[PDB]
UniProtKB/Swiss-Prot annotation:
EC numbers, comma separated: 3.1.26.4
GO term, biological process aspect, one: DNA replication, removal of RNA primer
Mutagenesis or variant effect for residue 70 to N: Loss of activity
The family this protein is said to belong to: Belongs to the RNase H family.
Disruption phenotype: In a strain that encodes a retron, the msDNA is abnormally sized.
Protein name: Ribonuclease HI
Location, primary (coarse class): cytoplasm
Protein species of origin: Escherichia coli (strain K12)
Catalytic class of the enzyme: hydrolase
Length: 155
C-alpha cells in the first residue's frame, strides 16, 4: 500500500445559491473510497469545504496526507485566513461570525489530527483523480438529495 494517505476533492455548484455537489476520492488502508452527494440549495464555496470534510472525517487516527484540489475558496481559507480566524475566535474584524463558520470549524476539527501536504492544482491541469471528482460533483449537483442546513444568504 501507499505510505501516504491521498485525498482528492472537488465542489461544484452553478447557482449562488443553487443545486450543488461534492466529490472526494480517498486512498486509505489499501482501499479507494469515493464519496459524492448533491444538495438542493448551496454554494460552490460550501461544496469545496464539504468534500474535504467528508474525506478527512473518514480517517480514524492521525495520518500523513496529501490533499489535492483545484478548490480556490478552500485554498484561500487554508493559506490566507484560518490562522487569523482562530486567533479572532472565528469572528470577522467587525465582530460577526465568519462566513461559513459552521463548515470551517468542522473542517478545522477534521484536520486537527493530520499532517497534511496541500496540492493546489489548477482547474485545467488536474490529475485523473481531480477530473473524476469534478465529474462526480457535477453529476451530484444535477441530482441533489440533501439539505445544506447551515447555508445562510449573504454575499
Amino acid at each position: 500500500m501507499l505510505k501516504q494517505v491521498e485525498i482528492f476533492t472537488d465542489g461544484s455548484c452553478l447557482g449562488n445559491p443553487g443545486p450543488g455537489g461534492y466529490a472526494a476520492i480517498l486512498r486509505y488502508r489499501g482501499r479507494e473510497k469515493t464519496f459524492s452527494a448533491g444538495y438542493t440549495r448551496t454554494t460552490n464555496n460550501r461544496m469545496e469545504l464539504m468534500a474535504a470534510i467528508v474525506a478527512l472525517e473518514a480517517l480514524k487516527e492521525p495520518c500523513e496526507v496529501i490533499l489535492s484540489t483545484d478548490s480556490q475558496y478552500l485554498r484561500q481559507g487554508i493559506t490566507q485566513w484560518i490562522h487569523n480566524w482562530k486567533k479572532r475566535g472565528w469572528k470577522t474584524a467587525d465582530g460577526k461570525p465568519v462566513k461559513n463558520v459552521d463548515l470551517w470549524q468542522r473542517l478545522d476539527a477534521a484536520l486537527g489530527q493530520h499532517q497534511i501536504k496541500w496540492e493546489w492544482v489548477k482547474g485545467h491541469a488536474g490529475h485523473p483523480e481531480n477530473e473524476r471528482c469534478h465529474e462526480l460533483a457535477r453529476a451530484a449537483a444535477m441530482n441533489p438529495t440533501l439539505e445544506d442546513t447551515g447555508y445562510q444568504v449573504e454575499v
